[PDB]
Design a protein around this motif. Structure first.
Motif, mmCIF file in Angstrom:
data_model
loop_
_atom_site.group_PDB
_atom_site.id
_atom_site.type_symbol
_atom_site.label_atom_id
_atom_site.label_comp_id
_atom_site.label_asym_id
_atom_site.label_seq_id
_atom_site.Cartn_x
_atom_site.Cartn_y
_atom_site.Cartn_z
ATOM 1 N N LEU C 42 1.248 -1.431 0.328
ATOM 2 C CA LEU C 42 0.135 0.251 -0.305
ATOM 3 C C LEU C 42 0.732 1.597 -0.501
ATOM 4 C CD1 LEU C 42 -2.358 -0.683 2.658
ATOM 5 C CD2 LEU C 42 -2.603 -1.125 -0.242
ATOM 6 N N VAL C 53 -2.312 0.439 -4.083
ATOM 7 C CA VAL C 53 -1.087 -0.168 -4.159
ATOM 8 C C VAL C 53 -0.129 -0.335 -5.047
ATOM 9 C CG1 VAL C 53 -2.984 -2.346 -3.842
ATOM 10 C CG2 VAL C 53 -2.499 -1.882 -5.644
ATOM 11 N N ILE C 65 -11.680 -2.320 -2.007
ATOM 12 C CA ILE C 65 -11.319 -2.665 -0.536
ATOM 13 C C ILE C 65 -12.781 -3.979 -0.275
ATOM 14 C CG2 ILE C 65 -12.126 -1.861 0.912
ATOM 15 C CD1 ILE C 65 -9.153 -1.708 2.484
ATOM 16 N N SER C 67 -13.555 -6.093 2.623
ATOM 17 C CA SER C 67 -13.443 -6.376 4.193
ATOM 18 C C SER C 67 -14.694 -6.709 4.723
ATOM 19 C CB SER C 67 -13.456 -4.677 4.911
ATOM 20 O OG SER C 67 -13.699 -4.793 6.247
ATOM 21 N N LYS C 71 -11.448 -3.207 8.162
ATOM 22 C CA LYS C 71 -10.052 -2.562 7.763
ATOM 23 C C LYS C 71 -9.552 -1.607 7.711
ATOM 24 C CE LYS C 71 -13.359 0.262 5.061
ATOM 25 N NZ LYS C 71 -14.066 -0.103 5.865
ATOM 26 N N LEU C 74 -4.873 -3.088 8.539
ATOM 27 C CA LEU C 74 -3.865 -2.902 7.774
ATOM 28 C C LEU C 74 -3.723 -0.993 6.904
ATOM 29 C CD1 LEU C 74 -4.530 -6.078 4.961
ATOM 30 C CD2 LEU C 74 -2.367 -5.240 6.723
ATOM 31 N N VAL C 80 -0.405 -6.090 1.135
ATOM 32 C CA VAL C 80 -2.327 -6.726 1.116
ATOM 33 C C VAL C 80 -2.372 -8.594 0.747
ATOM 34 C CG1 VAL C 80 -3.638 -4.508 1.738
ATOM 35 C CG2 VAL C 80 -1.939 -5.567 -0.750
ATOM 36 N N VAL C 89 -8.727 -6.128 -3.395
ATOM 37 C CA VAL C 89 -7.755 -6.237 -1.888
ATOM 38 C C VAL C 89 -9.072 -6.702 -1.283
ATOM 39 C CG1 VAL C 89 -7.232 -4.928 -0.152
ATOM 40 C CG2 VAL C 89 -7.002 -3.551 -2.330
#
Ligand SMILES: Nc1ncnc2c1ncn2[C@@H]1O[C@H](COP(=O)(O)OP(=O)(O)OP(O)(O)=S)[C@@H](O)[C@H]1O
Lengths: 49, 380, 370, 455
Positions: C42, C53, C65, C67, C71, C74, C80, C89
């Motif tokens: 990231l 990323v 993302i 989650s 989330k 990170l 990731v 992600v």
């Protein structure tokens, strides 16, 4: 001689298993590349990985 | 064979213990929004080479592949898609959609202290004039920009510090960082020493990018031998890229528009391994060393390292300062902690004179000092 | 009969080493992930459910993302789990480090406590007070406001049991322990000094109160002055990295370091300062009083005809290591085992004392003070 | 160490045959009571000098009539004089019913000596306006000594209420405190008093609770136990009423206490024939299975432990796996097991018991590394108790770590208990298995201060 289609296939890649993790998967680092958490075949135990 | 009994039935009940578990072995914010986000796109960030006239017709590079001729998408701000701006480029439409920040490198943000560690100016005793000169370097141009103007003189924007190991360089560093008020930046020297070709040069670039964002910021070097001052090179042809990084540091550092409102403190135990491409003043303007305090400073470092430990209210520090011929605050503090250990060897509530006597023994007279026993009179 | 017990214990320990979700929600996790997961980097997190990323090849994407866990755990700098379809992600990567972390981590206490060496208990008492006391009995340090020592150097003539002291302290501990032969840094890799260092001490901080044990780097104390006309390689830079890691900034925490050397004057005196390394301990050729204890340990469980006196051998010559005593106690046993005999007489010890002592040979006086 | 070493039977048989002979009468002086305890408490005051800032600081840990109430208990178990005993008034007036039992007994807890001073300190709180002050006061009279036996009759006379009046709570403190008081060959007169107690059967749990536990303290060390009409009567009157399962837990307590004293007892088979049913009385079966099997080289019940450890009823798991610290207490290197590696959270409670109180090596505190960090308030409550029993900075380092854990009210109470802890003899074997049903009311915690296992 009919069996030889299995010779006619792309075989595999090598991989650096750094360390396994929980829930039935491992980590694999490919030869020039990054690390990749991957899944296993039915024939292998993490006790043996 | 009683031990056989012991270990055998121990491990046998342990085998039973294993057999125990062996026989006893027998979405709203996470799942229904997934397929909605699956038609998104893996579109790549870039870096722009130039702008043609009257049109974007932008040419671009990402990192490694090629130099990419692109469009912009229609919903852009077509003004600021200029050079030096990383932007996002598509995998089908090949056009710029959204700008991005540059390569910020937030491991270069990681060397900023981001905290204020407490070591007070009242702890660094012994060097009341060296720290006075460094106070003139740091506190005075950042608070009273009058006398430089009212007399017509320049600030010492670089100050090297050199001397023996144990001396107080670290303390002065975190001491001015204790009373700083500014943006203080620690610099690990090997944050420049990365693997690949031409990257610590870009680390110096990241440094000067952070520097010229703001005002009165404080870069603190330490251990610049890790960066290096040795142009050690003859017909062996080995390690030279760090010297390229360091010459890049000299180039962006001083000469042809240097820093500005930036005050840099450096430190080295090895002054004779430096480069005279930084020994020149204008770059480094005070070569302030520290030396061993005679007795008053050593009694003072006794006062600082014993004000907050249990001692007798009868002991002096004159005689103890005497039996430190050549010593530092690290060695003095080792004496304090060592006499504390001797107080743990007895069961005391405080420390006494002989506690610190045998601690002075342990530190200095039981130093290694080679070889070793000096048993002679000839003197007394 | 006990060998069956020890074999069963070892094999059951291996069995225990082999003894190491959601019916549909876990399957949705299996579709929250693409099964070929990956490792990324990231750079920023624009928190509107799609992040940027960085990859090991360098292609950097707006990727959404997905989650399941929080989330926001990170961070930029933490890796990731990206897919191969849209590099989506995925989620929870517990923070993993190099392969070279479990390599330097001994998982056993394979040998025993202070009851293993024979007699040095003034300085064994020192390392006792400086590791065993601050760990187990940390009363008086808070109760007199005094901080415990950090660094311990072992030196002296070799084969005194520096390794034995090391493994002895590796027994009697509940704090986590690490084993580092610290000279491993012979690569042709620029940088790569701080990688092992920063990851080692980050790991050390993340686990527990621990000992970080460097072993035999007496060669690496490279004189602190130059390399001569052209030298600079990396080695000075790497030791300076370790120096700054130890007594620079970024407060040390509950981390201990014990070090061991054979030769000591060839070290780097930018390390040997107190505060950076606190204690120094002599391990000399002991005496003729604990040689009796070293023979006592080395004749604990061997077949010795008690007619013989090892104190005769101790009275013979007075300067040799305890490792020499071990070599004698095994070698005279072999000399007894020449011809299938029960116990050991005097002359096997005599021939073994002569045999092991083929070490010092010089020459020609002195000898001639005289 | 004669009186420490001896069980309940042989000092009463010893004081009766030595009541006959005695040969100097100084063994009637020493070897019943009062002379294990006459040298200690003055010498406790003399060679030790304990300061006041834990009364004030550890006695300052805020307020809330619970934590504060617990603090009174913590201050009370301080024993440099019986100062926290005589610290004024308005502290027990803030207190409430079962905590008023705990504070009325707390003057018992400060002073487990001073026979003449016990009557003249408790006498103000004797026969007072409050039921809990008088009943916890006679409880304190049962706490302070074990050889007086003249405190019986003011409580003993009152006991009968026939359903649920005042003197049944004096029955709780006085049947329990008289269980603290004497261990005869078989005292029978107090058990003939115990027949209208179990025949009384108040809805208050601790009536039959201190009935079973107190007659068990009379009955621990019986001659290979007995299946006599006392505990046979509480089996039949136990299976009479299937109500308030704490009865079905604490009656097999005193059952298994009467089973203690066994060497070869078939009483597990006898109560197996009489008792077993639906898992209340199969839990009685596992209680007799626990208490009848103190520990030897008898690994067949340890593989029985392996199989029936996997039973779907998860409270016979609790006590049946909880037997381990009784069984393998000497070969304690095998006592580390993978109970933390299991998931039936009461099992992590069981190992959490199984460490306990001895000197507590680094491996035990290492298990308190994980057991210190858990989220359920009965298990996070369960950790500081044995955690600070096993240690009677260093010591206070996990305590301030618990301050880092919370900063519920239970957890605060647990922390207070841990602070109290910070500062095969059967007498230390009974009261923590009496503690093993802690996930309950403070009425249960009114008896929580009856695990009197320390000098
Ligand atoms: N006046 C002083 N008062 C208190 N402590 C002092 C004083 N002078 C020195 N010290 C000690 O010296 C330390 C600071 O100096 P150093 O740590 O040696 O800096 P340094 O980075 O170690 O220098 P080198 O040459 O790189 S090892 C302090 O943390 C103390 O242990």
């Amino acid at each position: 001689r009919e069996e030889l289609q299995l010779l006619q296939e792309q075989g595999s890649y090598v991989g650096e298993v750094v360390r396994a993790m929980d829930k039935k998967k491992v980590l694999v680092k490919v030869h020039p590349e990054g690390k990749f958490v991957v899944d296993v075949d039915k024939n292998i135990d993490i006790n043996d990985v | 064979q009683v031990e056989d009994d012991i270990q055998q039935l121990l491990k046998k009940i342990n085998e039973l213990t294993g057999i125990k578990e062996s026989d006893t072995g027998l979405l709203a914010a996470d799942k229904q929004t997934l397929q909605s986000e699956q038609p998104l796109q893996v579109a790549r960030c870039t870096k722009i080479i130039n702008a043609d006239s009257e049109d974007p017709k932008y040419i671009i590079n990402v990192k490694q592949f090629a130099k990419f001729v692109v469009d912009l998408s229609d919903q852009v701000a077509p003004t600021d898609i200029e050079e030096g701006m990383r932007v996002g480029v598509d995998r089908n439409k090949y056009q710029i959609h959204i700008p991005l920040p540059p390569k910020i490198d937030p491991t270069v943000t990681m060397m900023q202290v981001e905290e204020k560690p407490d070591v007070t100016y009242s702890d660094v005793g012994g060097c009341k004039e060296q720290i006075e000169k460094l106070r003139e370097v740091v506190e005075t141009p950042l608070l009273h920009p009058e006398r430089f103007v009212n007399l017509g003189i320049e600030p010492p924007k670089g100050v090297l510090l050199f001397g023996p190991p144990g001396t107080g360089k670290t303390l002065c560093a975190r001491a001015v960082a204790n009373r700083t008020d500014a943006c203080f930046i620690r610099v690990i020297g090997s944050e420049l020493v990365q693997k690949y070709v031409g990257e610590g040069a870009r680390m110096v670039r990241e440094l000067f990018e952070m520097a010229r964002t703001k005002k009165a910021c404080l870069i603190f070097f330490d251990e610049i031998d890790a960066i290096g001052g040795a142009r050690f090179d003859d017909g062996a042809g080995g390690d030279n890229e760090v010297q390229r990084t360091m010459l890049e540091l000299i180039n962006q550092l001083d000469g042809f528009d240097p820093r500005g409102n930036i005050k840099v403190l450096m430190a080295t135990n090895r002054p004779d391994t430096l480069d005279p491409a930084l020994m020149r003043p204008g770059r480094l303007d005070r070569k302030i060393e520290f030396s061993l305090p005679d007795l008053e400073g050593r009694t003072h470092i006794f006062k600082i390292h014993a004000r907050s430990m249990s001692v007798e209210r009868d002991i002096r520090f004159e005689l103890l300062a005497r039996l430190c011929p050549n010593s530092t605050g690290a060695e003095i503090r080792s004496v304090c902690t060592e006499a504390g250990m001797f107080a743990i060897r007895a069961r005391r509530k405080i420390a006494t004179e002989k506690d610190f006597l045998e601690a002075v023994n342990k530190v200095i007279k039981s130093y290694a000092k080679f070889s070793a026993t000096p048993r002679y009179m000839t003197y007394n | 009969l006990e060998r069956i017990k020890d074999y069963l214990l070892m094999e059951e320990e291996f069995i225990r080493n082999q003894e190491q979700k959601q019916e549909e929600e876990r399957s949705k996790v299996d579709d929250l992930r693409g099964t070929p997961m990956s490792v990324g980097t990231l750079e920023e997190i624009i928190d509107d459910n799609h992040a940027i990323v960085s990859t090991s090849v360098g292609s950097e994407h707006y990727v959404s993302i997905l989650s399941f866990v929080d989330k926001d755990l990170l961070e930029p700098g933490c890796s990731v789990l990206l897919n191969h379809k849209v590099h989506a992600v995925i989620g929870v990567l517990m923070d993993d480090t190099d392969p070279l972390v479990t390599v330097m981590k001994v998982e056993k206490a394979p040998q025993e406590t202070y009851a293993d060496i024979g007699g040095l208990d003034n300085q064994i008492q020192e390392i006792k007070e400086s590791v065993e006391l601050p760990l187990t009995h940390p009363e008086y340090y808070e109760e007199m406001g005094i901080k415990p020592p950090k660094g311990v150097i072992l030196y002296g003539p070799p084969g005194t049991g520096k390794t034995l002291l090391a493994k002895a302290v590796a027994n009697q501990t509940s704090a986590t322990f690490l084993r580092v032969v610290g000279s491993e840094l012979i690569q042709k890799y620029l940088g790569d000094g701080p990688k092992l260092v920063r990851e080692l001490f980050r790991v050390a901080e993340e686990h527990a109160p621990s000992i970080v044990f460097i072993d035999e780097i007496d060669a690496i104390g490279t004189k602190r002055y130059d390399s001569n006309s052209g030298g600079e390689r990396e080695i000075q830079r790497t030791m300076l990295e370790l120096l700054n890691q130890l007594d620079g900034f970024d407060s040390r925490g509950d981390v201990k370091v014990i070090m061991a050397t054979n030769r000591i004057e060839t070290l780097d005196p930018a390390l040997i300062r107190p505060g950076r390394i606190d204690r120094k301990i002599e391990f000399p050729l002991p005496d003729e009083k604990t040689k009796k204890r070293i023979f006592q340990i080395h004749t604990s469980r061997m077949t010795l005809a008690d007619d013989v006196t090892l104190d005769d051998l101790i009275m013979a010559k007075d300067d040799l290591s305890g490792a020499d005593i071990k070599a004698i106690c095994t070698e005279a046993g072999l000399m007894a085992l020449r011809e299938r005999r029960m116990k050991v007489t005097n002359e096997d010890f005599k021939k073994s004392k002569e045999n092991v002592l083929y070490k010092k040979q010089e020459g020609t006086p002195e000898g001639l003070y005289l | 160490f004669l009186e420490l070493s001896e069980d309940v039977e042989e000092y009463e048989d010893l004081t009766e045959i030595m009541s006959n002979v005695q040969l100097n009468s100084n063994f009637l002086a020493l070897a019943r009571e009062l002379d294990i305890m006459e040298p200690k408490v003055p010498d406790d005051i003399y060679k030790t000098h304990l300061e006041n800032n834990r009364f004030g600081g550890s006695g300052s840990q805020v307020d809330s009539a619970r934590m504060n109430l617990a603090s009174s208990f913590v201050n009370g178990f301080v024993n440099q004089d019986k100062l926290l005993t005589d610290d004024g008034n308005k502290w027990l007036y803030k207190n409430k019913d079962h905590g008023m039992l705990s504070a009325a007994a707390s003057l018992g807890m400060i002073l487990l000596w001073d026979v003449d001073g016990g009557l003249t300190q408790i006498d103000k709180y004797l026969y007072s306006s409050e039921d809990y002050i008088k009943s916890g006061a006679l409880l304190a009279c049962g706490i302070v000594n074990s050889g007086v036996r003249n405190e019986c009759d003011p409580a003993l006379a009152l006991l009968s209420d026939y359903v649920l009046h005042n003197s049944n709570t004096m029955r709780l403190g006085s049947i329990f405190g008289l269980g603290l008081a004497y261990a005869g060959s078989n005292r029978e007169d107090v058990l003939t008093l115990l027949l209208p107690v179990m025949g009384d059967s108040k809805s208050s749990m601790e009536v039959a609770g201190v009935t079973a536990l107190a007659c068990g303290m009379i009955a621990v060390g019986s001659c290979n136990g007995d299946v006599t009409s006392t505990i046979l009567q509480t089996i039949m009157e136990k299976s009479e009423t299937e109500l308030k399962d704490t009865y079905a837990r604490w009656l097999p307590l005193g059952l298994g206490l009467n089973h203690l004293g066994k060497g070869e007892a078939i009483e597990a088979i006898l109560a197996a024939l009489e008792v077993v049913s639906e898992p209340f009385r199969s839990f009685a079966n596992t209680l007799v299975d626990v208490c009848a099997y103190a520990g030897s080289g008898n690994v067949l019940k340890v593989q029985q432990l392996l199989h029936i450890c996997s039973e779907h009823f998860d409270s016979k798991e609790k006590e049946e796996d909880k037997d381990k610290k009784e069984k393998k207490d000497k070969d304690k290197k095998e006592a580390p097991a993978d109970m933390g590696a299991h998931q039936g959270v009461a099992v992590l409670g069981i190992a959490l018991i199984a460490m306990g109180e001895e000197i507590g090596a680094e491996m035990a505190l290492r298990t308190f590394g994980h057991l210190l960090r858990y989220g359920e308030p009965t298990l996070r409550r369960a950790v500081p108790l044995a955690l600070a029993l096993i240690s009677v900075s260093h010591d206070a380092d996990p305590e301030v770590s618990y301050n880092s854990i919370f900063a519920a009210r239970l957890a605060a109470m647990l922390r207070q208990l841990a602070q109290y802890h910070a500062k095969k003899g059967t007498l230390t074997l009974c009261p923590y298995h009496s503690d093993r049903q802690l996930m309950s009311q403070v009425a249960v915690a009114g008896l929580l201060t009856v695990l009197v296992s320390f000098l």
